């Protein structure tokens, strides 16, 4: 049915506020029958506060959502990194057990698929199974994150090293991820895409007169940034969108705090801002985050100058680094961003062109991270 796709991920396709894997899956759904099988969910997830808990009454059944067949697999317990070295044989046993007991629905979908996409993380544990069920299927690993950054259990790191050479495609969001990938000939660089109609979404402006700065998203969200920034720049209005928290009592009156916004509504706040902010509270982040940050990519699409921690400035112009918790550095970076010109320095492929490269990177030899054949 055109090519049939299966995506394996710890996301569920139905969870509001899409991550990169959702945007890719939207493109898959345009190309053929597309399935999204959600992993690492269990009765144990209830005690931990999993974002998929609203979908619990649909567990272990197929639900159609936006043209995609979705399945939230719920087991009694799921394997995880206990972060105790003495518990490693228990972990390994739990992971082996998990991988050894796939539901019939997963097996059927694997068999039916022409292409199986595994997102970095728990999906690693099912790569060998996929090869056994459907050796004809193209196996594509989408490295949204490095395994060590997401801190997967030892079992997952070892299994990925073991199976990585067997994958048809290892599609890294950033070349900085390649150092920890134990393979070469099948390793490619395919960054995140952007919406093909980003420029149509930006107009009209949500802002009136004056200087407006924007932050979108809740990742490592640092309210202390805005406590300092709002006081130091009373002439700037700070638009804090989808931060995952409310109005911190230290925010100046020049901070406007918004609830979660759908992707398309955020664009006007981004395009029409003077500068953007990625207020990550910690610099204990991978080198690849400069490339993989979805919010920084959106700013970059418009050439929006950005203020962000030093650790995520990376190989980019128009990003002004500060040290989280250091007020003077915050102030200095904003000062620089206010005077930075807007220039579209970064080339941003749309999601369709991005998906083309994730699926068939060998057709786009510029994606190769190792010597071309």
UniProtKB/Swiss-Prot annotation:
Keywords: Carbohydrate metabolism, Cell inner membrane, Cell membrane, Glycosyltransferase, Membrane, Transferase
UniProt xrefs under InterPro entries: GumK_N
Cellular localization per UniProt: Cell inner membrane
Catalytic activity: alpha-D-Man-(1->3)-beta-D-Glc-(1->4)-alpha-D-Glc-1-di-trans,octa-cis-undecaprenyl diphosphate + UDP-alpha-D-glucuronate = beta-D-GlcA-(1->2)-alpha-D-Man-(1->3)-beta-D-Glc-(1->4)-alpha-D-Glc-di-trans,octa-cis-undecaprenyl diphosphate + UDP + H(+)
Name under which the protein is recorded: UDP-glucuronate:glycolipid 2-beta-glucuronosyltransferase
GO biological process, one term: polysaccharide biosynthetic process
The organism of origin for this protein: Xanthomonas campestris pv. campestris
SUPFAM superfamilies per UniProt: UDP-Glycosyltransferase/glycogen phosphorylase (SSF53756)
């Amino acid at each position: 049915r055109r090519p049939c796709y299966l995506v394996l991920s710890s996301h569920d396709f139905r969870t509001p506020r899409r991550a990169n894997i959702h945007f890719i899956t939207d493109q898959l759904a345009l190309r053929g029958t597309t399935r999204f099988f959600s992993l690492r969910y269990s009765r144990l997830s209830r005690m931990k506060g999993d974002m998929r808990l609203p979908l619990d009454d649909t567990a272990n059944t197929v639900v159609s959502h936006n043209g995609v067949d979705c399945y939230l697999w719920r087991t009694t317990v799921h394997p995880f990194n206990t972060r105790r070295s003495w518990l490693r044989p228990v972990e390994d046993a739990m992971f082996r057990w998990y991988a050894a007991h796939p539901p019939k629905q997963l097996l059927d979908w694997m068999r039916e698929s022409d292409v199986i996409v595994f997102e970095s993380g728990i999906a690693v544990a099912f790569i060998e199974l996929a090869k056994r069920v459907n050796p004809a299927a193209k196996l594509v690993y989408r490295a949204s994150d490095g395994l060590s950054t997401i801190n997967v259990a030892s079992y997952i790191e070892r299994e990925f090293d073991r199976v990585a050479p067997t994958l048809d495609v290892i599609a890294l969001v950033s070349p900085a991820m390649a150092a920890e990938v134990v393979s070469r000939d099948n390793v490619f660089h395919v960054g995140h895409g952007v919406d093909h109609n980003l420029d149509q979404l930006g107009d009209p402006s949500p802002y009136a007169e004056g200087i407006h700065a924007v932050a979108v998203g809740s990742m490592l969200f640092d309210p202390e940034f805005f406590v300092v920034a709002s006081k130091a720049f009373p002439q700037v209005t700070f638009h804090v969108i989808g931060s995952g928290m409310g109005r911190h009592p230290g925010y100046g009156d020049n901070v406007i705090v918004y609830g979660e916004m759908k992707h398309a509504q955020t664009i006007g706040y981004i395009k029409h801002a003077r500068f953007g902010i990625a207020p990550y509270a910690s610099e204990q982040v991978p080198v690849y985050l400069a490339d993989s940050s979805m919010k920084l990519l959106q700013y970059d699409f418009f050439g929006l100058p950005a203020v962000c921690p030093n650790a995520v400035v990376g190989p980019y112009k128009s990003r002004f680094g500060y040290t989280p918790g250091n007020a003077d550095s915050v102030i200095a970076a904003i000062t620089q961003a206010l005077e930075a010109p807007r220039v579209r320095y970064r080339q941003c492929l749309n999601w369709s062109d991005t998906t083309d490269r994730v699926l068939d990177p060998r057709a786009y030899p510029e994606t190769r991270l190792y010597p071309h054949p």
